[PDB]
A and B are shown apart, each in its own frame.
Chain A
Amino acid sequence: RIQLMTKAARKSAPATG
């Protein structure tokens, strides 16, 4: 089978600037 890439999912607080 072929290797499908995924973006890691993570909760992270908002950030400004």
Chain B
Amino acid sequence: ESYLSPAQSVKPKINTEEKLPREKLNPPTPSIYLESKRDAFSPVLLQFCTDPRNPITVIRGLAGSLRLNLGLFSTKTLVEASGEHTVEVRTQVQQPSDENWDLTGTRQIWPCESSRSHTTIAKYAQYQASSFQESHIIKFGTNIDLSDAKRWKPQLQELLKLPAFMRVTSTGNMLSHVGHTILGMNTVQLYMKVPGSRTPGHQENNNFCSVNINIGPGDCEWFAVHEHYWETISAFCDRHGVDYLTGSWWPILDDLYASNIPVYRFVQRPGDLVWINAGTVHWVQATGWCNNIAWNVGPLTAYQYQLALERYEWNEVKNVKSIVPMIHVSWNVARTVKISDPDLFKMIKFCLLQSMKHCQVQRESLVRAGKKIAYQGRVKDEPAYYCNECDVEVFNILFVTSENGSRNTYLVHCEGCARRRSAGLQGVVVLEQYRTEELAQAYDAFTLAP
């Protein structure tokens, strides 16, 4: 029933029981300098950054290296190009990056206060500038969508200069095979910061890699822990009553150290690019006044695919939506991308085989009941679908209802939630987007490329 085969794991062997000395608990972060575009575009850089033993890499002066005009992301330029669109803010307590104090200011805690409100780019910019002029609570403009191709064209054009595996869109990027928009993952988000502005502890959605460029003028301080330790960090969150996957928490560094967890700590200067490898747990605080831009990428590695599918299944256990629809993505990749890595090939092939089996069983049960199934094929830029009630991905066979609102709009449900409503599926239209033979031939057409 799982889309993963445990036997196929490529996770690195790490023995948490081996006690580590202070030195190994404070490892250095890999810090690369690129001299030429040739080096930035080398497959060797892709291999270096995605190696499962390398959780986070900083690529020093990458902006000047490739002649990226990061001034196009200055606050002044952004304001001039913006409209009145609403953006969101987090209000936080300004505190040292290694600290997070309880209300009485007597002890360190994990839960981290970070409340939501809304503003505009231009009004947040006035706050950022007034902060810098000195004219304690702070505000952080976060997850600002730079997705409008027209409004943000010069900005987005500058990012086309990055090496392919870092780009927002690329054929070696799983997120570019979603076929619909996931704002901030396969589109750019902007972060406008004052000193103290925090992005609290997390793994990326579905454990996808992340790219972050600091525009400046200030620095950002980063903290990171290898994927391997994530369950131990989750246990701290639970101990302190904050949700690991969806809550706002800031680790106590000595808790991680006591638990034998190495923590990477480094400073990201203006023009530096941080590559966050798959599954790396990280948190970030602005040291100065700066803007960052960031998005996700899913390079075609077995480690990435495994960690994305593992989180997909864990989200299902925890009743948390996976905003990357991994079954849909897996078939799209299989149909359109040559996979030469034998580990990654075996994993995708295994996932597709389970998906075919499920769809076949589902279809045979419907046919046995005499339930009409209509074909509604895929079309360009069509989204992937999820159950309205339980938020699981619903792939291929769709159980849709128009009962509420207009009889011409339908909500999608999984089989389970559809059958809980009307056990005879009365009033449920069943669609299939891929005929049995379309999936069979896509599966057979998917073979290991040399």
- The chain A residues found within 8 Å of chain B, CB to CB, are 1-17
Residues of A within 8 A of B181 (CB): 9
The yes or no answer to B130 lying at the interface (CB within 8 A) is no
User: Is there an interface contact between B376 and A2, defined as CB atoms closer than 8 Å?
Assistant: yes
Residues of A within 8 A of B412 (CB): 4-6
Closest-CB distance, A1 to chain B (whole angstroms)? 5
The yes or no answer to B253 lying at the interface (CB within 8 A) is no
- The chain B residues found within 8 Å of chain A, CB to CB, are 88, 90, 111-116, 142-143, 145, 180-185, 189, 199-200, 202, 205, 246-248, 296, 323, 376, 383-386, 388, 398, 400, 402, 408-412, 429, 431
* Bound-state Cα–Cα, A10 to B270, Å: 26
User: Is there an interface contact between A15 and B248, defined as CB atoms closer than 8 Å?
Assistant: yes
**In the complex, what residue of chain A is closest to B117 when comparing beta carbons?**
A15
Q: Which 4 residue pairs across A and B have the least CB separation, nearest first? A: A11-B184, A15-B116, A10-B183, A14-B248
* Bound-state Cα–Cα, A12 to B88, Å: 9
Sampled A-B contacts (28; CB under 8 Å): A1-B376, A2-B410, A2-B429, A3-B408, A4-B400, A4-B411, A4-B431, A5-B411, A5-B412, A6-B384, A8-B183, A9-B180, A9-B183, A11-B189, A11-B205, A11-B296, A12-B142, A13-B88, A13-B114, A13-B142, A13-B143, A14-B200, A14-B246, A14-B248, A16-B112, A16-B113, A16-B115, A16-B248
Closest-CB distance, A13 to chain B (whole angstroms)? 5
Closest-CB distance, A14 to chain B (whole angstroms)? 4
* Bound-state Cα–Cα, A14 to B283, Å: 12
Residues of A within 8 A of B385 (CB): 4, 6
Q: Which of B114, B145, B185, B429 contacts A14 (CB 8 A)?
A: B114
* Bound-state Cα–Cα, A12 to B141, Å: 11
Residues of A within 8 A of B400 (CB): 2, 4
**In the complex, what residue of chain A is closest to B407 when comparing beta carbons?**
A2
**In the complex, what residue of chain B is closest to A12 when comparing beta carbons?**
B143
Closest-CB distance, B293 to chain A (whole angstroms)? 13
* Bound-state Cα–Cα, A3 to B401, Å: 11
User: Is there an interface contact between B398 and A4, defined as CB atoms closer than 8 Å?
Assistant: yes
* Bound-state Cα–Cα, A7 to B387, Å: 10
Closest-CB distance, A17 to chain B (whole angstroms)? 5
Residues of B within 8 A of A5 (CB): 409-412
* Bound-state Cα–Cα, A8 to B183, Å: 9
**In the complex, what residue of chain A is closest to B143 when comparing beta carbons?**
A12
**In the complex, what residue of chain A is closest to B391 when comparing beta carbons?**
A7
Closest-CB distance, A6 to chain B (whole angstroms)? 4
Residues of B within 8 A of A17 (CB): 113, 115
Residues of B within 8 A of A3 (CB): 408-410
Residues of A within 8 A of B88 (CB): 12-13
Residues of A within 8 A of B90 (CB): 13, 15
User: Is there an interface contact between B184 and A4, defined as CB atoms closer than 8 Å?
Assistant: no
User: Is there an interface contact between A9 and B113, defined as CB atoms closer than 8 Å?
Assistant: no
Closest-CB distance, A8 to chain B (whole angstroms)? 7
Residues of B within 8 A of A16 (CB): 111-115, 247-248
Residues of B within 8 A of A1 (CB): 376
**In the complex, what residue of chain A is closest to B325 when comparing beta carbons?**
A9
**In the complex, what residue of chain A is closest to B202 when comparing beta carbons?**
A14
Closest-CB distance, B141 to chain A (whole angstroms)? 11
* Bound-state Cα–Cα, A1 to B384, Å: 16
**In the complex, what residue of chain B is closest to A13 when comparing beta carbons?**
B142
Given A9-B181, A10-B182, A13-B114, A2-B408 contact (CB < 8 Å) = yes
* Bound-state Cα–Cα, A17 to B112, Å: 11
Closest-CB distance, B182 to chain A (whole angstroms)? 5
User: Is there an interface contact between B386 and A14, defined as CB atoms closer than 8 Å?
Assistant: no
Closest-CB distance, B69 to chain A (whole angstroms)? 25
* Bound-state Cα–Cα, A15 to B323, Å: 18
Residues of A within 8 A of B115 (CB): 15-17
* Bound-state Cα–Cα, A10 to B188, Å: 11
Given pairs A2-B431, A6-B385, A13-B90, 5 additional interface contacts (CB within 8 A): A2-B402, A2-B408, A4-B385, A7-B386, A13-B143
